[PDB]
Amino acid sequence: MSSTSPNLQKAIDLASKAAQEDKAGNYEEALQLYQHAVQYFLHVVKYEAQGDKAKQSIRAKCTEYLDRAEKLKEYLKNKEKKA
């Protein structure tokens, strides 16, 4: 078995904390964590070397985190429209 790059480890940690913060209802913190996770996942997949299977899993996680993140942006826009 093989090595997880430090940038890719950053991506997973951030995502992990995003998920935690998401479920806790701290949506503003969650959103930032998701966004930065995606930033690292994109960097890794583009400029670090990995197999097809690795790229395919990163693409998958990228999709999920941007989905949720965008949904949180829209939520926060409407929470803010209140005032």
């Binding site: 966004q35 995606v38 994109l42 997949v45 693409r59 999709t63 941007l66 965008e70």
Partner: peptide, 13 residues
């Protein structure tokens, strides 16, 4: 090809 994700990530700022 990761353009769509890159496009969506950039917009998300």
């Amino acid at each position: 090809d990761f353009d769509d994700l890159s496009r969506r990530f950039e917009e998300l700022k």
